[PDB]
Amino acid sequence: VRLTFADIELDEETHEVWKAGQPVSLSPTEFTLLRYFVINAGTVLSKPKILDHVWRYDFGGDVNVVESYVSYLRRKIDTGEKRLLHTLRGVGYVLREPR
């Protein structure tokens, strides 16, 4: 029932994380983003599908909200410029082990 991806540790039972040895806090929406990313780890997620799975179906807003949320993730999970969580222009977002 646990969730793991290399140096990324997620327990959804009581909604907690640990990165490299330090539990951190996070917003509910971005937490659900991370949960979706780690359950679908190793698979590329399109932003249409990402929004349809994590946010409201009737969300009539713009698309830069997911970019803001993933930036908020990145300033909390990976310090280095080379990125564990990667972006594919026009295809969406993905979570990988850095190569």
Binding site: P48, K49, D52, Y57, D62, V63
Partner: peptide, 13 residues
Amino acid sequence: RERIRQIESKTMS
């Protein structure tokens, strides 16, 4: 055009 792409994808889904 971006909103139209999004609504087209939602309609297809």
